[PDB]
Write a protein that binds this ligand. Structure first.
Ligand SMILES: [Zn+2]
Ligand SMILES: [Zn+2]
Ligand SMILES: [Zn+2]
Ligand SMILES: [Zn+2]
Ligand SMILES: [Zn+2]
Ligand SMILES: [Zn+2]
Ligand SMILES: [Zn+2]
Ligand SMILES: [Zn+2]
Length: 233
DNA sequence: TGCGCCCCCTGCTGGTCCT
DNA sequence: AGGACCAGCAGGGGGCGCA
């Protein structure tokens, strides 16, 4: 007589298999507890596997490289890196993948809509993968003990994002102000040339011809000669 | 019950692609 | 260039078909 599960359509050869199944899916009773953490498992084999994680024992060793695993399947999975075997194939684009989890990620990102994308808490950027947001946080926003100087100025920064933000702030910016007027140069040579143009001030100018003079006396004697209002031929 | 077998999930890594 | 992208890749863990 087969042993039938009371709560579902499962049949087992022996009573032990049935009580094991009910513990896994129905009662969630895990009687084998670890002596070092809170882990409990339905089977002793799972607990013994979990203990290998505590002790770090790696009995299965790869015949190609130095890799050793705590499980046989992990070593089989590792062999795909040497063999280049890509068993799992996408059922839409027929793309090859090494692991089933990799394929699950692919169909999520490249074949599903309304995907929850993550926003950076510090800057206004959106990232598809959660782990890539971690890469963004570790690279852009993490403190740096050795400050990096600005390529354009002498300010120094300890955060990559602030440095790039400030470096981007020098776009279309004129490094020279030309105190005497509103001119603004960027080539550092036109500013020298513009400085020379200001030297010939000549504030005084004639009201009847284009000539200009540095001294009021020079202007007036020019005016009294060329532009006399009561000249008689 | 033991255990291999496969599937989960998670998250970092290093080359690729898009602006 | 530079950074998101994308698959590669290894960690711990679940259920059960077979012995
Ligand atoms: Zn059941
Ligand atoms: Zn433990
Ligand atoms: Zn290897
Ligand atoms: Zn696909
Ligand atoms: Zn950010
Ligand atoms: Zn700067
Ligand atoms: Zn000027
Ligand atoms: Zn004049």
């Amino acid at each position: 007589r087969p042993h039938k599960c009371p709560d579902c359509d499962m049949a087992f050869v022996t009573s032990g298999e049935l009580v094991r199944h009910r513990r896994y899916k129905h009662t969630h009773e895990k009687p084998f507890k670890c002596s070092m953490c809170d882990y409990a498992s339905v089977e002793v084999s799972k607990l013994k596997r979990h203990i290998r994680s505590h002790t770090g024992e790696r009995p299965f060793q790869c015949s190609l490289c130095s890799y050793a695993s705590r499980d046989t399947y992990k070593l089989k999975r590792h062999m795909r890196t040497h063999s280049g075997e890509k068993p799992y194939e996408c059922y839409i684009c027929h793309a090859r993948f090494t692991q089933s989890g990799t394929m699950k990620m692919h169909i999520l990102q490249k074949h599903t809509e309304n995907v929850a994308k993550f926003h950076c808490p510090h800057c206004d950027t959106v990232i598809a993968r959660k782990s890539d947001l971690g890469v963004h946080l570790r690279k852009q926003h993490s403190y740096i003990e050795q400050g990096k100087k600005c390529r354009y100025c002498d300010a120094v920064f300890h955060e990559r994002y602030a440095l790039i933000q400030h470096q981007k702030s020098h776009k279309n910016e004129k490094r020279f102000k030309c105190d005497q007027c509103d001119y603004a140069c960027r080539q550092e040579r036109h500013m020298i040339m513009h400085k020379r143009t200001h030297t010939g001030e000549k504030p005084y100018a004639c009201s009847h011809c284009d000539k200009t003079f540095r001294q009021k006396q020079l202007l007036d004697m020019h005016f009294k000669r060329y532009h006399d209002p009561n000249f008689v031929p």
